[model samples]
Target: SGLVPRGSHMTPQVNQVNLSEIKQVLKQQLAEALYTEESEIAEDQKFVDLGLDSIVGVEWTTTINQTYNLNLKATKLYDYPTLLELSGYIAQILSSQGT
Candidate 1:
């Protein structure tokens, strides 16, 4: 969390995500995991305020990995803790996975 990996002090990986892709996945995952409509959520929305739980978080993580081939932890989102922050982190992960 907090832009730092847990223990071992691994260097942070900063990624720049494609805005469209990030938004698309965010809406898709948030809707499927939280059982809500994309139209109901805003770009700067708070996932917790939209009723996110550990189950929903894991579901979203699974969706993200399946969609983007990312192997990330649920705690990453907790570290980011906001739409912008999480989006940024997700983008970084995707970027790091590039060939």
Candidate 2:
């Protein structure tokens, strides 16, 4: 079982994860919230650059919390700003949780 979409490149289950997995998941989340294609998302692109408001940020935050079983706030999204940054932050949190 995996959290990412079907056919998405799987990252090996180890101490760390492939950043591509994080990017893919972030892309999926952003695309769903923004009503756009995952292909349109770039790992380096900022959430604000994609037209994501606080409303969508809240939705995305909830989604990430539930999907990852993390206790996070919507404002945390702004702390990361970009997919790469967010993914790295998520990895740190998940690792800290000993997941």
Candidate 3:
């Protein structure tokens, strides 16, 4: 079924995501948080090794939630650990939503 049109106000929409795009976006966020080059972030590097700890991850979580329109729960960053893996997980979530 299609969505029902709402009131006069417009809303933000989340586009369907590619695995690479997920990786790229996450790397940019990680780079910004770490003050490192996006090019230096690797798809296979564990986030902990890249210095993304829970203390700094709440903001990261919020950014991702807003970007994807997700209500993330216990799925913390370390659950996926690597960019490649996490990107796949995010892709699955987005795809499942038909976004």
Candidate 4:
């Protein structure tokens, strides 16, 4: 049940997306949500440090799911507290899902 949909036109190889793109999308999402510059958001900075509240996390999760066609829980944000961490975790998850 956890498997991502295979043979979908939207499904790309794990490495095809790359961490840079993932991080960029995350930063873009945060910047749009928080009304801040993407440059203001450091890859290592926490969302809490960015002055974000829990509600933003829900929005971020929805964005990710819609943008990447991923199935992620809002609480997963707690597991990945920073952009660097989250990007890496996402890359790992995508890789594990296979090509």
Candidate 5:
């Protein structure tokens, strides 16, 4: 067999995690990572605007995976970093599993 890109497994479906839970975890993670309050983060807030960097992403990803086993690549997450987007991913994953 030849080497195949991991992107083969990469799709919109894999990122799906519960929206409310993701938001809660994201709030806690970002608050700690960015030294801000959870009340400040909005559902549509952009990580870039919040001064998010690699570290915050890693921290958030760890929390997310711990919570939901989302199993998404770091890069993919950084690309679609938003509450609604993340929720869509959860839907996709659930749908794929015929849940």
Candidate 6:
């Protein structure tokens, strides 16, 4: 049969672990990127509303992608649209792969 990307059969143990870890890591990066205190970065707010331009987003995306060894597009930023949402997406991706 041809190669397929589906049909995973792992339990859901890593979900929360990845979720909180990403929240901390990404929130920290956003603050550093924006030149603000970490506490000021609101996970609840949409990243677009933070006025994240291409330059900043490019650095952010590439660095985080490297950090997690994943290939996330800059466009995925708009797809998730918020720190909380994007963090959750990344968390779930990491969780499902048994990494």
Q: Who wins the TM-score comparison?
A: 2
Report the number of the highest-lDDT candidate: 2
Full candidate order by TM-score, most accurate first:
2, 4, 6, 3, 1, 5
- Sort order, lDDT high to low: 2, 4, 3, 6, 1, 5
Q: State the lDDT of candidate 1 residue by residue for 1-99, as single tens digits.
A: 323212223224434555445755576567667887765655576788788887777667777677777777788667754556667767767767773
lDDT of each residue in 1-99, candidate 6, tens digit only: 111113422334443445556766776777787777665666678665666777788678887888778888788776776677778888877877676
RMSD of 5: 12.8
lDDT of 4 by residue, 5-89 (tens): 2232233454465676577668777778777877577778887788677888777777777776778876867888788777887
Q: For model 2, give the RMSD to the true fold.
A: 3.5
List, in order, the clash count of every candidate structure: 1, 0, 0, 0, 3, 0
Q: How close to the true structure is residue 67 of candidate 2, measured as C-alpha lDDT? A: 76
Better of 1 and 5 by lDDT: 1
TM-score of each: 0.67, 0.76, 0.71, 0.74, 0.60, 0.73
Writing each residue's lDDT as its tens digit, candidate 5 over 1-99 gives 121222322224334434554445555666676788765665577766766777777666666566556676567457767655655665566556654
Question: Candidate 5's error at 50, in angstroms?
Answer: 1.4
| Worst lDDT 10-window in candidate 4 | 1-10
Query: On a 0 to 100 scale, what is the lDDT of residue 87 in model 3?
Result: 75
User: Once model 1 is optimally superposed onto the true structure by TM-score, how far is the C-alpha of residue 77 displaced, in angstroms?
Assistant: 2.6
Encode model 3's per-residue lDDT on 1-34: one tens digit a residue: 1111222222245455667667767877777877
Q: How high is the lDDT of residue 52 in model 5?
A: 73
lDDT of each: 0.64, 0.75, 0.69, 0.71, 0.58, 0.68
For model 1, what is the alpha-carbon lDDT of residue 37? Answer: 74
TM-score of 4: 0.74
Give lDDT tens digits, candidate 2, residues 1-34: 3445445455566455555666678888888888
Model 3 segments beyond 4 Å from truth?
A: 1-16
Candidate 4 lDDT (Cα, 0 to 1): 0.71
Task: Point out where model 4 deviates above 4 Å.
Answer: 1-15, 95-98
